[PDB]
């Protein structure tokens, strides 16, 4: 667990989690409960903040760049599946802005 990775866990994930718009990204999209029976055929690599958080907490990542790619996948999946004025896209967009600002302050490995 590099210090960039502990920053992803202690700073990026924590800051995003507390956001009022973050909760649709806490858990995998459940295509049955939400009646999106095409979701897994369009979105081949599902990702969510809960899975990212678990991977950080259990030292799954080899580098912070893998963690960031999961974040990038999470947001991009949202945009792939949804429409530009959907509430979910506005929520993703607000979260993504904070994400970009927070990883800009990520410390260097030393």
């Amino acid at each position: 667990k590099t210090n960039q990775l502990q920053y992803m866990q202690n700073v990026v994930v924590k800051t995003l989690w507390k956001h009022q718009f973050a909760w649709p990204f806490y858990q995998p999209v459940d295509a049955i409960k939400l009646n999106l029976p095409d979701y897994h055929k369009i979105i081949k690599n599902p990702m969510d903040m809960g899975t990212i958080k678990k991977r950080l907490e259990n030292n799954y990542y080899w580098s912070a760049s893998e963690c960031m790619q999961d974040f990038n996948t999470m947001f991009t999946n949202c945009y792939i599946y949804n429409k530009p004025t959907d509430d979910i896209v506005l929520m993703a967009q607000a979260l993504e802005k904070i994400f970009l600002q927070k990883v800009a302050q990520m410390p260097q490995e030393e």
Partner: peptide, 6 residues
């Protein structure tokens, strides 16, 4: 998709 999440 997903409706009105506000």
């Amino acid at each position: 998709a997903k409706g009105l999440l506000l």
